[PDB]
Amino acid sequence: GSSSTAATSRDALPNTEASGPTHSKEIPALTAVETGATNPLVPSDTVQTRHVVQHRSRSESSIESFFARGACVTIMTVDNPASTTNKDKLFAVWKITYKDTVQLRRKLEFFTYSRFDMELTFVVTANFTETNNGHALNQVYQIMYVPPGAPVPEKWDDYTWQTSSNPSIFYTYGTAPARISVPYVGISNAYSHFYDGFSKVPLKDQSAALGDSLYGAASLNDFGILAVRVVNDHNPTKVTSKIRVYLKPKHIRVWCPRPPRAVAYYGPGVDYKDGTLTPLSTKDLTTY
Amino acid sequence: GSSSTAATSRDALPNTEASGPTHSKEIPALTAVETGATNPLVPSDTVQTRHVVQHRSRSESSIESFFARGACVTIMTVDNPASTTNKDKLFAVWKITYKDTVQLRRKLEFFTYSRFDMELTFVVTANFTETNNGHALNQVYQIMYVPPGAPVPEKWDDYTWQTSSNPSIFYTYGTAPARISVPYVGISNAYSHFYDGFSKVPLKDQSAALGDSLYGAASLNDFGILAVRVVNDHNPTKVTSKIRVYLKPKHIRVWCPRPPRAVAYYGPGVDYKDGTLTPLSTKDLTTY
Amino acid sequence: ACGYSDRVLQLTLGNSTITTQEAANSVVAYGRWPEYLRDSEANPVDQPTEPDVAACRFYTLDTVSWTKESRGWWWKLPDALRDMGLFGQNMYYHYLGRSGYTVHVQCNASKFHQGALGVFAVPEMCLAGDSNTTTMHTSYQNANPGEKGGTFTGTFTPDNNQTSPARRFCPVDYLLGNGTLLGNAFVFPHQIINLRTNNCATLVLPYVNSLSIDSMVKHNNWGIAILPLAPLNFASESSPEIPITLTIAPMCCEFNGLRNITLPRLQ
Amino acid sequence: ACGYSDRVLQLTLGNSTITTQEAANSVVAYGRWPEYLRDSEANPVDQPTEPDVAACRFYTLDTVSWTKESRGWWWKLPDALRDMGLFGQNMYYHYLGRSGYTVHVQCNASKFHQGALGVFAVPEMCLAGDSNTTTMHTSYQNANPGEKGGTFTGTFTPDNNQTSPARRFCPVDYLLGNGTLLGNAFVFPHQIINLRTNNCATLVLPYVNSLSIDSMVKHNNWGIAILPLAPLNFASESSPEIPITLTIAPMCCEFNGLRNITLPRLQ
Amino acid sequence: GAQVSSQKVGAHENSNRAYGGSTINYTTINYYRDSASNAASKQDFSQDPSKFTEPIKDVLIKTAPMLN
Amino acid sequence: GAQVSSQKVGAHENSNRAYGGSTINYTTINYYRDSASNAASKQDFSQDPSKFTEPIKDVLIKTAPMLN
């Protein structure tokens, strides 16, 4: 019928207690960072304080709230040309990842591992390209998820678009952006944001080529592809379209904090590029 | 399950009581405004009255009801031109404020301080500009809130529009006007409609330029900007669009009443301009 | 009362004991002591091998030398122990393995020396490569140095031989060899060996991974990074040197999927 | 048990904290902690000003330098703090004032240095003048040096300029600058900074006077005298130097008889 | 979790077995966790104007002389 | 099968017979069998940072010497 609702994210932080002068063998201020610990001080340990009823909370910096936003992870281009074109009708294929853009990637990479349900939202825009007056009727798009192993479409109209088992979204141009949710689908107990290893052990008794693989890569993160097409048949006036994909990680847990990316990303691994390694600017030691 | 519901805004005002002739040392009519008080009289203090059961109420002049309206606070212009243009595609940037227009500003300025949740509603209109017959497909707009400190877009298509953390609205042309709510977000306990001070103390030991700042300005009111773009790629026929922003202050409290603005506004402060200082018209003292 | 102290410790595992008289307490990474795989989290169903004292004991790696020019050193686990006694044999005979570790870094000097080493244990310590024409190209052989470890550098030097690329890491010290600032490495479990204070670092590491158990031969779970936060100095000598020695004990290691031994291509 | 120690102290007053790791306990002069003026001993009837944290906090005076030729230093209280923040302002705006103090003298060196400073707090530290033709002639300006303090000398040198007399103190070190033998200064509240043992002296001083409250601008209640009981030495150097720093916090200060500010002739 | 409140009825239809009379209520259910998302309830309070109309230290008795 | 929860109210309207005061609740009903379809509740927990700020084996007492 109706369900009605231990430190929570929106609880007020601790009050400041009043504290007075001190003269003793207690030494909060002195410490030793060699131990690997941070000194847990509060202001009353080193100055006189008044009483303050604290009302601020950390509600907006919970993991869930830090990540509660859709971020663009790709832009997919498709078109619907005249049937008289020498060029094939363009359908798009995108290998699913959060590493083609940088903002969400940097936020997730504050952590080594994560678990979340994924919400995907799709914004679709279209335009004419030839300075012509010809027209086009409202387009329908098919967004098909092709998981690893399923046949990837080779033509905008081949049999794979039947989608008997792959999930597909048929989106109608001009309606609210499409949206679906996906569960935590990892083949591990958490997604790995970093994998310090290889997918193959090179064996002595085998050629180097046969035992080779990329550093830091594994099917831990192969999630397959999105394949997108304009379903409408060819039209005399060409229309080009873009599908922007937004990812929001919801119901999220994360583990093992990391220093954030400080120089520009350079591919899907942690590699860096010459000429981008100077994030800090000039400032003199005794200048405010 | 179901909740069901001390002078309230919709209560009837006080009844008039019947009162008769009087001859005594009680002197309600005589008073002294030097004290700073207003004489609290009602008609039965100075004339004979009948009994009247009063039904009128002040329900529509509660603070909430006086402000319960969306008011236009800005008009933002954007466009989507041909790719062959010498001119850049126009995206808009607006520093959030209620001071670019005058009507809501004057109402809020009956008070010195306020607290409210803000409802923003967005009305979007578009038109062709070149006397051409070319067409355009339905536009999608991105309205991105860029809070102070976040990277402001420099091009309609640069990386900032990824919005991984800024809130953005993707609005589809021709649908119901977009709308969001924002909490009371002030860095103070109330918004200041007037700040009699500076953001910098000029120090003797420092150049005048280094200690200078504008009178009456402070980040009390820096709320960042709205950045708006047409998401669709360039189209051969240029379309221009306008986004009208409406602000309704809801759940509002206000403090310290002020005389309302009586001469034309002149910038974001209280300054006035020569030639606008004569609000009153001519009327002879003994003419009705 | 009896004189017990933070600074004076004894560690005993299997047939091996470590003593120290200038410790700065010791760290248990993320507050989690090593443990065997619980039944509720188990995954391979075959009865695991658990070598216990045969492999859970202190192994000392080759000693390195700290000088004024040292930029830093790195090792990966289990890789640095791959050739260590019965731990190494159990690792290569089984498809799967998991293990925690006690890491004890040793570096003594004198009351007239100075310098400070940051000792960091990093889960999934992915390092940057040497190439600006191909990414994720460091080879298995160069990514896995075994007990000799590798080093950090103060300068990124791209490999320009596209005919026969070196395929190795080029780990820049102030970028923690991975594109993030070294000043923030302290969010990883760590200690500092600051010579005026202490002569060792002790880190107890739980098995950490997004799986209960995995291929030790394919994947390193932890990296150990040692960098000079403050350079070595001594009296007024221009070229002081002091040794740094690593001794590491596997803890709660268990293995599954026994078969013939893995014979990896390591050169 | 926890390692608390005589030698390691933290003092916090107002927004200021002092730490020390080589203390030799600390002294509370005559066993009396500072206190506000009790009603049963009160005398001006106006409501007093009590600045509390605005003035009861550590103020550091200009540092001096100890060498093999140093004969000693002296300061007077409240005079040495007359220009210190809100303590100084409250002192000059009021006819009357009283205050106690925590005095912390700082002087570190090395295990190869030696030397010992006697740090004495003297109630009514009247000092001898430079004249053999007039007594009690030291001027207000020369009697009150403010934070720079003054110095002791090993030799009495009479001022012979009777035309324009210098009118200053000539405080001889072994006579404690006042005609009594320095070896007996230990009956005053004191500590010794003996460099092999400790690097600081801490003296907590109650307000002492023959009145409950008095003119701070006319009268100093306490003198601080620092003299080398054993001279500075180091390795086999002929001219070693080490700094001495004074930091003093007023305690329980209260003031009466508020008016316009006193603007004294100090030069 | 519905809030039921009453309306102040102005024009009443010819009805007292459905509209005008037997107290007409309305229902509100909040759909969002953030209270900033809520509509305004308009159930507001009034107060005495005295802090502006009579801010004098000694109480004003209107039948008496203001200055005495 | 409604879930009713309370809102943490920030700006309060002038009202305590409808808005600001008498605990404002909100309602959630899940429409889908898959929990991945659910909205986020944001009713989240905090924890002590000690596994990162104090990962030392012997307890830190801040008033005491860290090294003893």
Ligand SMILES: CCCCCCCCCCCCCCCC(=O)O
């Ligand atoms: C019709 C739309 C179907 C959408 C299909 C979504 C498929 C699963 C995607 C998994 C996203 C993984 C994000 C984390 C990746 C990582 O491990 O680094």
Ligand SMILES: CCCCCCCCCCCCCCCC(=O)O
């Ligand atoms: C996607 C839309 C986001 C909308 C972001 C709203 C940002 C906060 C605006 C605060 C408005 C303040 C009005 C009172 C200003 C004042 O203090 O004078």
Ligand SMILES: *C(=O)CCCCCCCCCCCCC
């Ligand atoms: C109180 O809320 C329980 C009574 C529920 C009545 C029906 C609710 C109508 C639909 C609300 C859907 C949830 C809104 C996010």
Ligand SMILES: *C(=O)CCCCCCCCCCCCC
């Ligand atoms: C609990 O769920 C029982 C109370 C039902 C309240 C009204 C439900 C509102 C409509 C939900 C429709 C079903 C959604 C798939």
